[PDB]
């Protein structure tokens, strides 16, 4: 209560210093990460089977998790692919609020359970499970520029001498390494083999035997024999740690004398546990680190820490090799947080200007100086108890909130003046009067203000999840406002505000203060002669009122929509794609020719290029690829032709030449989704491969026959490509005493490669592969020079039991919740809905073969609630107003200037040519929350003439219009300068800049010009009605 | 290369498409790695709109695979009676032995298709031949099990 | 001791360089806080201080 | 659900000493209630589907999507999802001089998924121009596969 | 809520169920609690009433 | 059947590279010991809720599972939440010397 406080300014001294230091305690033990957690809990498990097509992976491993994935809580969906590659991956997601460690241990617990049930050299692999909604704090490059060393080299060592050093930091949470260290390789040679009588599975054998570790006992282990004097343990064979001992392997012992060593069939040497992809940064091999932030962790003080860590680690680095970082999202916090703290500071100057200007002494240009900084400082109190962080997402919610914040200083101070001008009543009692007047009405707004933000703290899902970072922040913000409004505020003005003269409005007054005195003074007369005229002819306005709300439908339908602006990440990716069959030679080919493009008509713009040859976000394989381009500073690709966008389109124009390939450059997501649906094909019964796709491919092509309605849909996946079919003939291989066993192992192994076991290099344990030499391992014509043993100990070619043929499978084989399926990508037609091209797209789907199904995932999903809400807020909104007014009409004239304040902002939006995206509609809620603000006060001092001296209806409005002219002018002036650096901002996350400031700029004119006139007439026309 | 387009359409099913490359003159006898021509993959996939058309535009009826395999071995091997008849009126050697002896008989006998062993029989396809193995005819069925297609093969 | 050698405490010890390092500000932030209330609960700044 | 956790932290230090057939076999750890919540009854109307048949369509097409369900701890077929059935001869095997291990032999070595890597595979020689995957032997699909067993 | 999870997934596979194939529900635990709260409701409204 | 060193670089290193990231982690403490045993202990910070800092052990502990040695997988490795002391030591004899 305020007169509380103003008899006692020093217990208010003590709360304001209280919240500073609650505030600042906070500023200082709170997390920090350009985004918070938004997407839904989900886990990975994947699985690895060395030399196994797409097929044999799923039916052997990726069915037999998904049976098992079974008891598991709060799954929403399981998702699964199985690659050529001899990879799996099941993702499985969960409901939003689940807590990610509790679902991982029970995914991970019934893998376990089902272990037993797979391959054995998919055990001997291994599988993981991790959680992999996170998302990557930077990636670490580490290239070769002496050209000493290749990839695998710099891999080995990344992993043995910098991936643990780094994992132990400050703040990283997870580190993946973008290699594989060393692992001893044996390349076999069939011409070799055969002519010492030997096959891959003699090899084997050997290794297996000479390579381990064998346990022994003890000397004078217990039970002894008494007298023993001692107890010393017995070393047995141990892992092999040199290329030079497995060479030395024994395999066999001629009858002549002479041995035949592993050397003599094999080259040994150390390379890579797999050659899938090859990586280069700028064409020179290199390696990389994808580092995680940990939770709870500051991701500024963890970018520094790996920083320091790696320079306390140069000293050791071979020669050439240096570290680069091609990914980094720590700039964008920096400048993200830099310009809310400029934004805050100018904000105040601003603010100490038009109050100086209005008002012209220091005293009370003084007072919000104090009580803004101090409900800063206490909402990071409030956003820390809450369990929040400081995230691009709260950052942008408080340069919303200032506008409140400002407000409620200068409305409190100004009034105080106002009436010491109109009254000679010293501060402290003039502060009790003019606080006896604003009292109920701020109460009023917190609440009015709380029906329109909290309400947006309910959508669900990722969506949730946004808007509940700046709901719950401006809210916090808002309430903590009025609080201070309440206490700290008006002691501040019985205390340091000195009094003033009745009458004494400094119109004769020395220079420009006098002038602009009489000038404002004289403007206050024509404006309420205005308002004046205006009453006389209230049905002229009540037309043009109609004719905003009608352009404002009209102007929001045609307004297109994205969920948050796209921006300027300094980087951007392009995909690249080769034909079925295509190697990995002539995929490099055009990656160089597109770090070659990068690297010259795009010196000035672009850094590096990373090229990942083989990998691909739908899709893996030799015929695959990824360019990261990485860009120079934004203070270095000045213009919008420097942009990402412009640079990506001319960049895809210019790889359209390519005869070779399909290769296009894109911007990536603001978030790591997108737009579109995500359409899931499935077979419900047993249709197969085949039949599925057909009945996908008949979906495309119908959906080909709306392109009014349904753009750009196409298969998330990979097409089927020939194989090469090996039949072994049963019949022949007992005939020629050649077990099938022997057959499938030297082919599996020579062709497909085998890990062996394990050894230990410099103290570290790595794997052993063996595998064909390549060029015996290359064509179909090879596999006759493969000879296997038979029982009476000749040598049997392979073309001596078998047949072959060309064939047709799938490379990428996915299901969906335990079903066959293919994915299918889609987006609406220009001016359409998503809600739309989704019921079409079901539509299409029902006319599909029998026994072929469809379901929506990730965003189709979680995919509906705002009417519904903004029907519960409207409706509270109403509820307040009608309480503080005691009315069940009068709160309808201040519910009326909710669409004055969003032409405007439709009108600023359309015309820049901006998205209704997170940012727009919180600008929205922002600017209709303070034109609200401006309506009540305008209603409540109107009202309160009528009630206390009698006051006429008109009479009553004009003197409560006259009242109310400064201050919402004066906070409206101070909000559209420091909202100013916003809309012009170019570059480095203005994206969000420019959305959150002409949204509001553009709605703040539109909410105040209209406002002082339009009010007044919704309250009279009101009030003659009811 | 319109070629691949073609292949592409040949392999999918797209008749609108593959005719309209017909117009453009498309290469009909085009190959990927495997040696495969859009005959080739409309045999095997089996659509006959396609494998006429093709036909009708100087394809090669015995177009060999990099193993030696050919249309009819595709069509007969895969269950589409309709396409082995028209192949065989253009031409198709009913007695091509694959790079391991394999027929267009054995591989339907291989998997049954009664129907289909009909027809090759009455356009004068060996008996007596022999695969790599030196399986016949009547060989493959009695090991598979076909009673029926024994009968038929004696 | 030579050069890349260091040192680390554990257990009792760990929590006791903690509950050391921990104290002059724990002092301070009390002397901090009893000030205030008092001076709020008497509406004064020269008595809360003697 | 940490009582769960818990309970299988201890099981998995059992698992490795219990017999190979029992690992097989799938051990399960459930956390539901002892009494029925209900029971979902799958009837045929027509005469196409005998009570194995439907047993088995249950079981491959309706208890995974359930069982999979939050809130469910464990569900019960009351029935038996189908498996290749090899029921043996003895008066036959003793014929062949054959015997149940022979058989079992038989169906590991040719009732196999192995994995055959690729033409032109990582890491190729320089000059590749093709890349397919090799494919071998596959699973058996039908009895009649299985019967063709030598 | 797990009954009317397991409804809703029931509800999914129907449309592909071979012909003849349909489901029975000869045992639940459910229809008892939702129908005896809403007895209770009914004896609310006439208490009021009454 | 594995001495000190080996024990270290096949287990102990492999878990330890994992175990980087969790919750709460003060420290982390190890020994290898000549019998093959190995011990990691990790202690978090004080109020920490110790059933949530079992499970996201076992899931960074599950990473390491399949790049351990098979006689160890074979063994069961185990997390369990631990101490150090003793809360008592239960004696038991025999009195008529009838038992060893």
Same mark, same amino acid.
């Given at each position: 209560?305020?007169?509380?406080?103003?008899?006692?300014?020093?217990?208010?001294?003590?709360?304001?210093?209280?919240?500073?230091?609650?505030?600042?305690?906070?500023?200082?033990?709170?997390?920090?990460?350009?985004?918070?957690?938004?997407?839904?809990?989900?886990?990975?498990?994947?699985?690895?089977?060395?030399?196994?097509?797409?097929?044999?992976?799923? =039916?052997?491993?990726?069915?037999?998790?998904?049976?098992?994935?079974?008891?598991?809580?709060?799954?929403?969906?399981?998702?699964?692919?199985?690659?050529?590659?001899?990879?799996?991956?099941?993702?499985?997601?969960?409901?939003?609020?689940?807590?990610?460690?509790?679902?991982?241990?029970?995914?991970?617990?019934?893998?376990?359970?089902?272990?037993?049930?797979?391959?054995?050299?998919?055990?001997?692999?291994?599988?993981?499970?991790?959680?992999?909604?996170?998302?990557?704090?930077m990636?670490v490059?580490v290239?070769?520029?002496?050209?000493?060393?290749?990839?695998?080299?710099?891999?080995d060592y990344v992993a043995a001498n910098m991936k643990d050093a780094i994992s132990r930091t400050s703040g990283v949470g997870d580190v993946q390494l973008?290699?594989?260290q060393?692992?001893?390789?044996?390349?076999?040679?069939?011409?070799?083999?055969?002519?010492?009588?030997?096959?891959?599975?003699?090899?084997?054998?050997?290794?297996?035997?000479?390579?381990?570790?064998?346990?022994?006992?003890?000397?004078?282990?217990?039970?002894?024999?008494?007298?023993?004097?001692?107890?010393?343990?017995?070393?047995?064979?141990?892992?092999?740690?040199?290329?030079?001992?497995?060479?030395?392997?024994?395999?066999?012992?001629?009858?002549?004398?002479?041995?035949?060593?592993?050397?003599?069939?094999?080259?040994?040497?150390?390379?890579?546990?797999?050659? =899938?992809?090859?990586?280069?940064?700028?064409?020179?091999?290199?390696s990389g680190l994808g580092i995680?932030?940990a939770?709870?962790?500051?991701?500024?003080?963890t970018?520094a820490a790996i920083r320091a860590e790696l320079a306390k680690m140069e000293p050791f680095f071979?020669?050439?090799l240096?570290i680069?970082?091609?990914?980094?999202?720590?700039?964008?916090?920096?400048?993200?947080?830099?310009?809310?703290?400029?934004?805050?500071?100018?904000?105040?100057?601003?603010?100490?200007?038009?109050?100086?200007?209005?008002?012209?002494?220091?005293?009370?240009?003084?007072?919000?100086?104090?009580?803004?900084?101090?409900?800063?400082?206490?909402?990071?109190?409030?956003?820390?108890?809450?369990?929040?962080?400081?995230?691009?997402?709260?950052?942008?919610?408080?340069?919303?909130?200032?506008?409140?914040?400002?407000?409620?200083?200068?409305?409190?101070?100004?009034?105080?003046?106002?009436?010491?001008?109109?009254?000679?009543?010293?501060?402290?009692?003039?502060?009790?009067?003019?606080?006896?007047?604003?009292?109920?009405?701020?109460?009023?707004?917190?609440?009015?203000?709380?029906?329109?933000?909290?309400?947006?703290?309910?959508?669900?899902?990722?969506?949730?999840?946004?808007?509940?970072?700046?709901?719950?922040?401006?809210?916090?913000?808002?309430?903590?406002?009025?609080?201070?409004?309440?206490?700290?505020?008006?002691?501040?003005?019985?205390?340091?505000?000195?009094?003033?003269?009745?009458?004494?409005?400094?119109?004769?007054?020395?220079?420009?203060?006098?002038?602009?005195?009489?000038?404002?003074?004289?403007?206050?007369?024509?404006?309420?002669?205005?308002?004046?005229?205006?009453?006389?002819?209230?049905?002229?306005?009540?037309?043009?009122?109609?004719?905003?709300?009608?352009?404002?439908?009209?102007?929001?339908?045609?307004?297109?929509?994205?969920?948050?602006?796209?921006?300027?990440?300094?980087?951007?990716?392009?995909?690249?794609?080769?034909?079925?069959?295509?190697?990995?030679?002539?995929?490099?080919?055009?990656?160089?020719?597109?770090?070659?493009?990068?690297?010259?008509?795009?010196?000035?713009?672009?850094?590096?290029?990373?090229?990942?040859?083989?990998?691909?976000?739908?899709?893996?394989?030799?015929?695959?690829?990824?360019?990261?381009?990485?860009?120079?500073?934004?203070? =270095?690709?000045?213009?919008?032709?420097?942009?990402?966008?412009?640079?990506?389109?001319?960049?895809?124009?210019?790889?359209?030449?390519?005869?070779?390939?399909?290769?296009?450059?894109?911007?990536?997501?603001?978030?790591?989704?997108?737009?579109?649906?995500?359409?899931?094909?499935?077979?419900?019964?047993?249709?197969?491969?085949?039949?599925?796709?057909?009945?996908?491919?008949?979906?495309?092509?119908?959906?080909?026959?709306?392109?009014?309605?349904?753009?750009?849909?196409?298969?998330?996946?990979?097409?089927?490509?020939?194989?090469?079919?090996?039949?072994?003939?049963?019949?022949?291989?007992?005939?020629?005493?050649?077990?099938?066993?022997?057959?499938?192992?030297?082919?599996?192994?020579?062709?497909?490669?085998?890990?062996?076991?394990?050894?230990?290099?410099?103290?570290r344990?790595?794997?052993?592969?063996?595998?064909?030499?390549?060029?015996?391992?290359?064509?179909?014509?090879?596999?006759?020079?493969?000879?296997?043993?038979?029982?009476?100990?000749?040598?049997?070619?392979?073309?001596?039991?078998?047949?072959?043929?060309?064939?047709?499978?799938?490379?990428?084989?996915?299901?969906?919740?335990?079903?066959?399926?293919?994915?299918?990508?889609?987006?609406?037609?220009?001016?359409?809905?998503?809600?739309?091209?989704?019921?079409?797209?079901?539509?299409?789907?029902?006319?599909?073969?029998?026994?072929?199904?469809?379901?929506?995932?990730?965003?189709?999903?979680?995919?509906?609630?705002?009417?519904?809400?903004?029907?519960?807020?409207?409706?509270?909104?109403?509820?307040?107003?009608?309480?503080?007014?005691?009315?069940?009409?009068?709160?309808?004239?201040?519910?009326?200037?909710?669409?004055?304040?969003?032409?405007?902002?439709?009108?600023?939006?359309?015309?820049?040519?901006?998205?209704?995206?997170?940012?727009?509609?919180?600008?929205?809620?922002?600017?209709?929350?303070?034109?609200?603000?401006?309506?009540?006060?305008?209603?409540?001092?109107?009202? =309160?003439?009528?009630?206390?001296?009698?006051?006429?209806?008109?009479?009553?409005?004009?003197?409560?219009?006259?009242?109310?002219?400064?201050?919402?002018?004066?906070?409206?002036?101070?909000?559209?300068?420091?909202?100013?650096?916003?809309?012009?901002?170019?570059?480095?996350?203005?994206?969000?800049?420019?959305?959150?400031?002409?949204?509001?700029?553009?709605?703040?004119?539109?909410?105040?010009?209209?406002?002082?006139?339009?009010?007044?007439?919704?309250?009279?026309?009101?009030?003659?009605?009811? | 290369?319109?070629?691949?387009?073609?292949?592409?359409?040949?392999?999918?099913?797209?008749?609108?498409?593959?005719?309209?490359?017909?117009?453009?003159?498309?290469?009909?006898?085009?190959?990927?790695?495997?040696?495969?021509?859009?005959?080739?993959?409309?045999?095997?996939?089996?659509?006959?709109?396609?494998?006429?058309?093709?036909?009708?535009?100087?394809?090669?009826?015995?177009?060999?695979?990099?193993?030696?395999?050919?249309?009819?071995?595709?069509?007969?091997?895969?269950?589409?009676?309709?396409?082995?008849?028209?192949?065989?009126?253009?031409?198709?050697?009913?007695?091509?032995?694959?790079?391991?002896?394999?027929?267009?008989?054995?591989?339907?006998?291989?998997?049954?298709?009664?129907?289909?062993?009909?027809?090759?029989?009455?356009?004068?396809?060996?008996?007596?031949?022999?695969?790599?193995?030196?399986?016949?005819?009547?060989?493959?069925?009695?090991?598979?099990?076909?009673?029926?297609?024994?009968?038929?093969?004696? | 001791?030579?050069?890349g050698?260091g040192?680390?405490?554990?257990?009792?010890?760990?929590?006791?360089?903690?509950?050391?390092?921990?104290?002059?500000?724990?002092?301070?932030?009390?002397?901090?806080?009893?000030?205030?209330?008092?001076?709020?609960?008497?509406?004064?700044?020269?008595?809360?201080?003697?």
């Open positions: 209560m305020p007169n509380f406080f103003i008899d006692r300014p020093i217990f208010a001294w003590v709360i304001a210093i209280i919240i500073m230091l609650a505030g600042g305690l906070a500023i200082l033990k709170l997390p920090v990460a350009q985004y918070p957690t938004i997407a839904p809990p989900a886990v990975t498990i994947s699985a690895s089977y060395p030399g196994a097509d797409a097929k044999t992976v799923q =039916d052997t491993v990726t069915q037999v998790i998904e049976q098992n994935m079974n008891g598991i809580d709060n799954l929403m969906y399981m998702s699964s692919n199985s690659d050529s590659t001899g990879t799996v991956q099941i993702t499985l997601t969960f409901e939003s609020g689940t807590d990610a460690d509790i679902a991982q241990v029970q995914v991970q617990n019934k893998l376990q359970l089902a272990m037993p049930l797979l391959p054995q050299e998919v055990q001997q692999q291994g599988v993981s499970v991790e959680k992999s909604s996170s998302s990557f704090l990636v490059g290239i070769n520029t002496d050209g000493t060393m290749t990839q695998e080299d710099i891999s973008f290699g594989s060393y692992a001893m390789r044996i390349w076999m040679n069939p011409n070799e083999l055969n002519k010492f009588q030997l096959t891959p599975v003699d090899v084997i054998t050997a290794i297996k035997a000479q390579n381990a570790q064998v346990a022994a006992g003890q000397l004078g282990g217990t039970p002894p024999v008494k007298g023993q004097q001692l107890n010393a343990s017995i070393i047995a064979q141990t892992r092999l740690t040199s290329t030079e001992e497995f060479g030395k392997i024994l395999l066999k012992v001629n009858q002549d004398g002479s041995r035949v060593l592993l050397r003599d069939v094999a080259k040994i040497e150390l390379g890579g546990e797999n050659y =899938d992809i090859i990586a280069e940064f700028n064409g020179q091999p290199a995680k932030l939770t709870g962790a500051n991701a500024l003080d970018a071979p020669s050439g240096k680069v970082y091609p990914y980094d999202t720590t700039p964008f916090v920096k400048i993200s947080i830099h310009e809310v703290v400029k934004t805050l500071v100018e904000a105040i100057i601003l603010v100490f200007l038009v109050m100086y200007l209005f008002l012209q002494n220091f005293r009370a240009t003084l007072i919000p100086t104090i009580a803004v900084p101090v409900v800063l400082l206490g909402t990071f109190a409030v956003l820390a108890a809450f369990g929040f962080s400081i995230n691009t997402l709260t950052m942008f919610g408080m340069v919303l909130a200032i506008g409140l914040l400002v407000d409620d200083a200068i409305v409190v101070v100004e009034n105080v003046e106002r009436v010491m001008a109109e009254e000679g009543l010293p501060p402290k009692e003039a502060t009790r009067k003019s606080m006896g007047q604003i009292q109920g009405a701020l109460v009023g707004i917190a609440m009015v203000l709380s029906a329109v933000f909290v309400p947006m703290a309910f959508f669900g899902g990722s969506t949730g999840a946004i808007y509940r970072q700046f709901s719950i922040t401006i809210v916090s913000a808002m309430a903590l406002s009025v609080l201070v409004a309440l206490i700290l505020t008006p002691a501040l003005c019985a205390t340091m505000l000195k009094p003033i003269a009745k009458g004494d409005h400094g119109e004769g007054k020395k220079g420009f203060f006098g002038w602009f005195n009489r000038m404002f003074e004289k403007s206050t007369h024509h404006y309420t002669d205005s308002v004046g005229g205006i009453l006389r002819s209230t049905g002229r306005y009540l037309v043009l009122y109609l004719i905003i709300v009608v352009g404002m439908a009209y102007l929001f339908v045609r307004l297109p929509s994205s969920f948050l602006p796209d921006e300027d990440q300094g980087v951007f990716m392009t995909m690249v794609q080769l034909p079925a069959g295509a190697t990995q030679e002539r995929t490099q080919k055009v990656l160089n020719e597109v770090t070659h493009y990068y690297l010259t008509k795009e010196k000035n713009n672009v850094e590096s290029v990373f090229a990942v040859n083989g990998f691909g976000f739908a899709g893996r394989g030799q015929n695959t690829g990824i360019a990261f381009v990485s860009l120079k500073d934004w203070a =270095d690709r000045p213009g919008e032709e420097n942009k990402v966008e412009a640079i990506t389109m001319r960049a895809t124009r210019a790889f359209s030449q390519i005869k070779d390939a399909m290769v296009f450059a894109f911007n990536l997501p603001a978030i790591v989704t997108a737009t579109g649906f995500d359409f899931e094909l499935i077979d419900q019964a047993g249709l197969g491969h085949e039949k599925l796709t057909q009945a996908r491919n008949q979906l495309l092509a119908e959906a080909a026959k709306h392109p009014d309605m349904l753009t750009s849909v196409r298969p998330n996946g990979l097409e089927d490509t020939p194989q090469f079919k090996i039949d072994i003939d049963q019949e022949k291989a007992q005939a020629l005493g050649v077990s099938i066993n022997d057959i499938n192992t030297t082919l599996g192994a020579a062709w497909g490669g085998s890990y062996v076991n394990d050894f230990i290099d410099r103290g344990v790595k794997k052993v592969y063996v595998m064909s030499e390549a060029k015996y391992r290359m064509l179909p014509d090879d596999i006759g020079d493969w000879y296997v043993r038979a029982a009476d100990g000749q040598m049997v070619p392979f073309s001596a039991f078998s047949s072959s043929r060309w064939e047709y499978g799938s490379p990428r084989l996915e299901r969906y919740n335990g079903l066959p399926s293919m994915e299918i990508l889609g987006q609406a037609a220009p001016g359409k809905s998503t809600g739309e091209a989704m019921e079409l797209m079901e539509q299409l789907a029902s006319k599909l073969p029998t026994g072929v199904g469809y379901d929506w995932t990730g965003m189709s999903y979680q995919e509906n609630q705002a009417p519904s809400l903004y029907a519960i807020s409207l409706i509270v909104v109403f509820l307040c107003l009608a309480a503080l007014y005691e009315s069940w009409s009068i709160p309808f004239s201040v519910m009326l200037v909710v669409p004055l304040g969003v032409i405007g902002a439709l009108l600023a939006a359309t015309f820049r040519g901006l998205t209704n995206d997170v940012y727009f509609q919180v600008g929205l809620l922002t600017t209709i929350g303070l034109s609200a603000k401006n309506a009540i006060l305008i209603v409540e001092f109107a009202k =309160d003439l009528m009630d206390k001296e009698g006051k006429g209806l008109i009479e009553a409005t004009l003197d409560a219009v006259r009242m109310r002219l400064r201050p919402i002018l004066m906070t409206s002036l101070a909000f559209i300068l420091g909202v100013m650096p916003l809309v012009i901002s170019t570059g480095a996350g203005s994206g969000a800049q420019n959305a959150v400031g002409t949204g509001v700029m553009g709605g703040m004119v539109t909410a105040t010009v209209l406002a002082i006139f339009f009010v007044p007439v919704f309250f009279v026309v009101v009030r003659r009605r009811f | 290369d319109l070629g691949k387009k073609l292949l592409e359409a040949a392999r999918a099913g797209q008749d609108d498409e593959v005719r309209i490359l017909m117009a453009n003159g498309a290469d009909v006898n085009a190959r990927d790695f495997t040696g495969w021509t859009p005959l080739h993959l409309a045999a095997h996939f089996g659509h006959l709109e396609i494998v006429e058309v093709l036909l009708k535009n100087g394809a090669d009826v015995n177009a060999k695979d990099s193993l030696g395999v050919t249309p009819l071995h595709l069509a007969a091997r895969r269950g589409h009676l309709e396409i082995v008849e028209v192949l065989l009126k253009n031409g198709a050697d009913v007695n091509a032995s694959d790079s391991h002896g394999f027929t267009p008989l054995h591989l339907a006998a291989k998997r049954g298709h009664l129907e289909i062993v009909e027809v090759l029989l009455k356009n004068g396809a060996d008996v007596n031949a022999q695969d790599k193995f030196g399986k016949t005819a009547f060989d493959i069925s009695i090991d598979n099990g076909n009673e029926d297609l024994a009968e038929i093969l004696q | 001791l030579p050069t050698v040192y680390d405490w554990t257990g009792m010890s760990y929590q006791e360089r903690l509950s050391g390092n921990q104290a002059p500000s724990l002092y301070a932030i009390s002397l901090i806080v009893v000030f205030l209330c008092l001076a709020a609960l008497y509406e004064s700044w020269s008595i809360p201080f003697s």
